């Protein structure tokens, strides 16, 4: 079970937060600032795995913008990386050569790709075509 989804820049600026566990905003800032401090203070041959507070945390560096999640520590761990890679391909297919400013200016569309890809922490569409087709159909409703 994915407890949260975090997207933070290299400088530490929060670009996307998501909470699949309802913890309050002071706890949100505490946990978010802690995770931002942890991942930015770790090297480049460290497996992209952190055991942080009963969570086998799954992050990945794709660019200066860093991505972060944490699956429940009883599941497989590499599939969370495949989830993040699939969502990268979702942003690339709906946005088109997805820039940082595409994530900056059009963040709500990335939130909606996340909504039509994962609710509750789990994958709701495994097709890389049906999900982007459905969000282009919902955009076609406008």
């Amino acid at each position: 079970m994915i407890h949260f989804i975090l997207l933070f820049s290299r400088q530490g600026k929060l670009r996307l937060q998501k909470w699949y566990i309802t913890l309050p905003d002071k706890e949100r800032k505490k946990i978010t600032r802690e995770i931002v401090q942890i991942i930015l203070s770790r090297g480049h041959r460290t497996s992209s795995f952190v055991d942080w507070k009963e969570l086998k945390l799954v992050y990945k560096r794709y660019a200066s913008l860093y991505f972060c999640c944490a699956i429940e520590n009883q599941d497989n761990e590499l599939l969370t990386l495949e989830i993040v890679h699939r969502y990268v391909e979702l942003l690339d297919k709906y946005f088109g050569n997805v820039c940082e400013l595409d994530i900056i200016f059009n963040f709500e569309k990335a939130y909606f790709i996340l909504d039509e890809f994962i609710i509750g922490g789990e994958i709701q569409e495994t097709s890389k075509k049906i999900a982007v087709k459905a969000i282009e159909d919902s955009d076609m409703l406008q």
Binding site: Y62, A63, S64, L65, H85, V88, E89, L91, D92, N97, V98, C99, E100, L101, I104
Partner: peptide, 10 residues
Amino acid sequence: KGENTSAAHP
């Protein structure tokens, strides 16, 4: 800048 790079490079 360093922001205009696309992520996945399809």
